[PDB]
Amino acid sequence: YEHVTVIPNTVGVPYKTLVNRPGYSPMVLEMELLSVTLEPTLSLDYITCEYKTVIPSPYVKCCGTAECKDKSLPDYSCKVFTGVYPFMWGGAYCFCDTENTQLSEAHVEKSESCKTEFASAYRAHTASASAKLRVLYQGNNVTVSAYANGDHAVTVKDAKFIVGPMSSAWTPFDNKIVVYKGDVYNMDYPPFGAGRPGQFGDIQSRTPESEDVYANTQLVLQRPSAGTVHVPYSQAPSGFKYWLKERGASLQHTAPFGCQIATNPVRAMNCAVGNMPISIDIPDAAFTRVVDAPSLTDMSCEVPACTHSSDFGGVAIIKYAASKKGKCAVHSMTNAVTIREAEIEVEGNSQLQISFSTALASAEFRVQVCSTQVHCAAECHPPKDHIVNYPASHTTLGVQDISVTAMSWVQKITGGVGLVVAVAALILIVVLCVSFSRH
């Protein structure tokens, strides 16, 4: 028997679905999402890391001008400085006083640190949804791990589960993301081969091991101080280091819908967005024939206490006369009231307790305790605690879910005004009918 139901994508909140298969005693399955993962498909664009500026020892010609040679190195710069008379610890380096010329050169290489310290620039396309579902089946807890794209069937205890597709394609990840050691950011990183100095992606490579490096640090060689050999330069500070200080909050801190973000692989977990359809194929052996089930008659529901405290604060006691010893599934007939127990045991003339959660001011609801139904009603009190550390187990209320006392007042007021109108309307109708009787 194939049963199709839909639950909210909210994680950690159990939902109950009634499987009503004619000829068999009603079955109730409790399903809870333990984990929902949206794993984006990524394509690496480039690696950003700290750059190393390489400055080979300067070449000094005591007499005669040095010549520059072009090189293909990532950001090669070379300049000749005439009129230089450098000193070493033991005295002037050159015999020549004025004809001395220095050749300075420098280039940029990706640092050895880039092997472990780097940010990866990725493009995200679509997400592969995956979910772990806890199901109470035949009274046992079975965990179903399946892809939530609607195309993965998982069979446990001969029950086949289809999960998804997701009702929402929403993902916390943007088209372009940057990943740094567990921290994922949504940013429009600059195009490969066209990065800018002092900004993220100033030095770029396609892979951490690639020797193909783009660099735009605008390295400029300056004239050495008189009497010295050092090679001064002006260069934009690594955009990677600046980014690390200016990263801002990561997606696990900024994402909507309470999404948890993790890396290796990049994952968005437990995003409370949309619904997740579930289809369960339940084998005939799993069902108990109606005639083989206890029949419950002479039922009466009493509700000794009710508080709409979001944690099954309500308790109801149901008296019953069971035809025989056995088990019966319990289901609420209204969405407004959720019952914690999926099944109870029945025997003879006795009573059972059920814990329930509702937002209702007045808990008017019906309960199916096996094959028969009983009507429950109560006045529910508010909680004293303003804040809790858990999501409500009950659903929200509509405008029609006001209290019984409030409804009585509304009916009396509405009826009072409606009666005045109905009477005034009748008087006018009679007068008009008379007015047309005098034509």
Ligand X SMILES: *[C@@H]1O[C@H](CO[C@@H]2O[C@@H](C)[C@@H](O)[C@@H](O)[C@@H]2O)[C@@H](O[C@@H]2O[C@H](CO)[C@@H](O[C@@H]3O[C@H](CO)[C@@H](O)[C@H](O)[C@@H]3O)[C@H](O)[C@H]2NC(C)=O)[C@H](O)[C@H]1NC(C)=O
What binding mask, one character per residue, do residues 41-70 give for a copy of itself by CB under 8 A, x or -? x-x-x-------------------------
CA separation for the pair 213, 202 (Å, rounded): 10
CB of 14 to ligand X, least distance (A): 5
Q: Which stretch binds a copy of itself (CB under 8 A): 105-113, 192-200, 399-407, 421-429?
A: 192-200
CB of 72 to ligand X, least distance (A): 22
Smaller CB separation from ligand X, 186 or 355: 355
CA separation for the pair 246, 240 (Å, rounded): 10
CA separation for the pair 139, 402 (Å, rounded): 36
Smaller CB separation from a copy of itself, 68 or 194: 194
CA separation for the pair 189, 176 (Å, rounded): 7
Give the CA distances from residue 151 to residues 17, 163, 165, 166, 280, in Å, rounded to whole numbers and listed in that order: 22, 8, 8, 11, 13
For tokens 């200080």, name the residue. Answer: 245
Question: What single string gives the DSSP state of each residue in 90-110?
Answer: TEES-S-SSS-EEEEEEEEEE
Q: Is 191 in the site for a copy of itself (CB under 8 A)?
A: yes
The interface with a copy of itself within residues 133-162 (CB under 8 A) comprises: 147, 150-155, 160, 162
Smaller CB separation from a copy of itself, 45 or 341: 45
User: How many CB atoms are located within 10 Å of the residue 62 CB?
Assistant: 14
Phi/psi-derived region of residue 158, left when phi > 0, alpha when psi is between -120 and 50, beta in every other case: left
Per-position b or e across 167-202, b if 16+ CB within 10 A of its CB: eeeebbbeeebbbbeebbbbbebbeeeebebeebbb
Given a copy of itself, ligand X, none, residue 14, with its beta carbon under 5 to 8 Å by kind, binds ligand X
Smaller CB separation from ligand X, 108 or 342: 342
CA separation for the pair 348, 323 (Å, rounded): 7
Q: Is 125 in the site for a copy of itself (CB under 8 A)?
A: yes
CB of 282 to a copy of itself, least distance (A): 15
Given a copy of itself, ligand X, none, residue 353, with its beta carbon under 5 to 8 Å by kind, binds none
Smaller CB separation from ligand X, 41 or 141: 141
What binding mask, one character per residue, do residues 105-124 give for a copy of itself by CB under 8 A, x or -? ------------------x-
Token pair of 67 as six digits: 């010549």
Instruction: For the chain, give the longest Cα–Cα distance.
Output: 139
Smaller CB separation from a copy of itself, 160 or 223: 160
Smaller CB separation from a copy of itself, 41 or 113: 41
The interface with ligand X within residues 132-161 (CB under 6 A) comprises: 134, 136, 139-141
Q: Is 126 in the site for a copy of itself (CB under 8 A)?
A: yes
Sheet with 275-281: strands ordered across = 2-8, 275-281, 159-163
E-assigned strand segments in 306-402? 314-322, 326-329, 331-332, 337-339, 343-346, 349-358, 365-368, 373-376
Given a copy of itself, ligand X, none, residue 287, with its beta carbon under 5 to 8 Å by kind, binds none
CA separation for the pair 27, 75 (Å, rounded): 72
Tell me the three state secondary structure of residue 339.
Answer: strand
The only residue of 8, 14, 197, 277 in contact with ligand X, by rule CB under 6 A: 14
Given a copy of itself, ligand X, none, residue 305, with its beta carbon under 5 to 8 Å by kind, binds none
Given a copy of itself, ligand X, none, residue 43, with its beta carbon under 5 to 8 Å by kind, binds a copy of itself
CB of 355 to ligand X, least distance (A): 9
Given ligand X, a copy of itself, none, residue 152, with its beta carbon under 5 to 8 Å by kind, binds a copy of itself
In contact, 16 and 338? CB cutoff 8 Å: yes
CB of 327 to a copy of itself, least distance (A): 26
CA 18 to chain CA centroid, nearest Å: 28
**Which residues would be at the binding site for a copy of itself (CB under 8 A)?**
41, 43, 45, 123, 125-126, 128, 147, 150-155, 160, 162, 191-194
**Which residues would be at the binding site for ligand X (CB under 6 A)?**
14, 134, 136, 139-141
